Design a binder for this molecule. Sequence first.
Ligand SMILES: Nc1nc2c(ncn2[C@@H]2O[C@H](COP(=O)(O)OP(=O)(O)CP(=O)(O)O)[C@@H](O)[C@H]2O)c(=O)[nH]1
Ligand SMILES: [Cl-]
Ligand SMILES: [Mg+2]
Ligand SMILES: [Mg+2]
Length: 398
Amino acid sequence: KPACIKALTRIFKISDQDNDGTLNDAELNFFQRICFNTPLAPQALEDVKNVVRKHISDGVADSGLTLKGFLFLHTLFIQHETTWTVLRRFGYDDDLDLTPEYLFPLLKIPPDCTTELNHHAYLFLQSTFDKHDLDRDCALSPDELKDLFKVFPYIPWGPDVNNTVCTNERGWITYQGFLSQWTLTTYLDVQRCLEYLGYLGYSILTEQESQASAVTVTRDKKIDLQKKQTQRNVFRCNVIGVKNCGKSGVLQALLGRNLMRQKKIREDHKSYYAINTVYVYGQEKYLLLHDISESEFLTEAEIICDVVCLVYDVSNPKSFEYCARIFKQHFMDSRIPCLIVAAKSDLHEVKQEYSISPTDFCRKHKMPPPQAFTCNTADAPSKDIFVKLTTMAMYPHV
Ligand SMILES: Nc1nc2c(ncn2[C@@H]2O[C@H](COP(=O)(O)OP(=O)(O)CP(=O)(O)O)[C@@H](O)[C@H]2O)c(=O)[nH]1
Ligand SMILES: [Cl-]
Ligand SMILES: [Mg+2]
Ligand SMILES: [Mg+2]
């Protein structure tokens, strides 16, 4: 029984689309249709409300069904089969748990293909954000996130999510940052995104066969390279360099954060990812950065990307050798574009101990010139390199 109440309470929360605490006639009729194929007459609906009002006082607020009122009607129909109709319609099984078919619809992704949310999927998330942004500040406070996750069986996002997407003045995920996190999750872990969409009741509220009906599968990367044109909107860039060469500073710069703001980031909440929108020649795209920590190996995983960002420290004389090394053993004869970034360029430039200068190296292997970059500036860092990286990802040849 307590398991039954738990499910119905969630089903209520999902059905309350405007998230006001009641099921108005608009939302109530929607619920009846998806469950019982036919809604009730406008005043025959008012008759049911009367039955509620004449038993409990807190069962009907405004002229819409409250949760207590909703749970009350569940008891009335028993003292059956009406409830199980509702439960099964919302993905629950006999054990009152969400079925694998509902939460994990199989979506086999072809090799060298990526996953994006379609336009209607984004719209669903845009409304989803608005429903829980009750303070209208275009950001989700910790309370507004707890509210959003009350349809989730566990907390899906950790405190590092705030160091991955755009946040506001107080570290709260903004409206744009919110969509960036979903864009990010969909790209890296589509099965997790589909699971999360199930918790939000996407498949039901949008009346579609599965959560998978929100994901777009882009074509083979090889075809994009051969046809020299892509339709993708999300591009992944791997950031590679020695330890403490300023990689994390590059990632956080994409989020618009100064170096001084970065020093207040606790390591418990550290993130090796950063995602944001970038405009390339009037086209809006998503740039996805992945901080690759200096390890003994570089597998076939940390090399798959649309563009590589080799970062070295100008105050570190031995740092650029790493860039030259990694480039020569993974990206020298690769169809992946590479951009060298001279990070910490606010510091005094020290002569690199490598055999050849960064400048000449970029000519020997036909790359763009080493880009000067710093996150240690007043206001927010420059988005120049991020436009560059995205541009090279979109047009590898040009
Ligand atoms: N002056 C200055 N210092 C910087 C800049 N970027 C980073 N730093 C400093 O350099 C150090 C290393 O930066 P960080 O971004 O953490 O490097 P990292 O390569 O991510 C470290 P790891 O390899 O372990 O991930 C920090 O002390 C940071 O404050 C910059 O543009 N200017
Ligand atoms: Cl559900
Ligand atoms: Mg409502
Ligand atoms: Mg808010």
